[PDB]
Amino acid sequence: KGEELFTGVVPILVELDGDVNGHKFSVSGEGEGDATYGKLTLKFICTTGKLPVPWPTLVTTLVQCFSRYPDHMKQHDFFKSAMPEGYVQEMTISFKDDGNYKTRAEVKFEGDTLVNRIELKGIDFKEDGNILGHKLEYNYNSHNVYITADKQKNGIKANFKIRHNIEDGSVQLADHYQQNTPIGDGPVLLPDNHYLSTQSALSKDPNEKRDHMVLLEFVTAAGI
Ligand SMILES: [Mg+2]
Numbered sequence: 001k002g003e004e005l006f007t008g009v010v011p012i013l014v015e016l017d018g019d020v021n022g023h024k025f026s027v028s029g030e031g032e033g034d035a036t037y038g039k040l041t042l043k044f045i046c047t048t049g050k051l052p053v054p055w056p057t058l059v060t061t062l063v064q065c066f067s068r069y070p071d072h073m074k075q076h077d078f079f080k081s082a083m084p085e086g087y088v089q090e091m092t093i094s095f096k097d098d099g100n101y102k103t104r105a106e107v108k109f110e111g112d113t114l115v116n117r118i119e120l121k122g123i124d125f126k127e128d129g130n131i132l133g134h135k136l137e138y139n140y141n142s143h144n145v146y147i148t149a150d151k152q153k154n155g156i157k158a159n160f161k162i163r164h165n166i167e168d169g170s171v172q173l174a175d176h177y178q179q180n181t182p183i184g185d186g187p188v189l190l191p192d193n194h195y196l197s198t199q200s201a202l203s204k205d206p207n208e209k210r211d212h213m214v215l216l217e218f219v220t221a222a223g224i
Contacts, residue, residue: 005109010034010114011030013110014062014116015115015116016118018119020053021099021122024048025049026048027044027047028045029045033066034066035067040215045208051211053122054164056137058213059200060091063107065114067079067221070222073224075189076191076224077221078149079180083109084108085183085184086109086183089107090102091177093176095173098126100124101120102120102122104118108183130164135167136164136165137164141163144195144197145176149191150181154188155181156190159176159178161175162174194223196219196222197222
């Protein structure tokens with residue numbers, strides 16, 4: 001059973017290949033998760049050079065199996081129930097008045113390591129918009145990820161709106177539509193409606209010259 005794999009600290013690897021308006025890039029991340037505390041600590045590096053989009057726009061794409069599900073809600077934790085075989089996570093991320101990302105990720109164990117492998121495609125971004133113009137602040141607001149069951153796909157859907165702070169005081173909305181489906185043929189937990197309360201802090205490694213992001217995140221299930 002999947003939740004048993006998450007009682008301790010688990011190493012995490014994240015590998016993303018991206019193309020946004022023909023700008024090709026890759027990101028590699030390493031860190032660890034401790035679902036007992038809903039806690040993630042990761043460092044991401046752009047391995048191809050400078051990142052052509054703002055780091056905050058990639059946070060939702062770059063492992064909700066590390067959410068803390070309170071004991072009384074453990075029957076609603078799809079994400080761990082799909083492990084170790086894993087799940088596919090697909091998102092459409094619609095940036096208001098701008099372009100969109102489409103992502104497809106596979107999240108699964110490789111040995112004792114939780115791996116998130118992602119392909120991201122971004123299209124129809126404005127050259128001097130907040131994304132390609134790098135007008136987003138290097139910070140991150142707290143959000144609720146609203147989860148519903150998708151019985152016919154044996155999985156879940158999520159809907160939420162990320163509020164990215166713009167450097168002039170305004171907000172760039174990024175609407176998210178998410179679908180997750182198990183990779184394996186074993187049974188999974190199909191949840192009642194609930195949400196994940198997520199808090200994220202972005203920072204820099206003072207000794208790192210590559211383009212990078214240090215992320216500390218807490219994710220807690222609620223709403224039941
Ligand atoms: Mg077109």
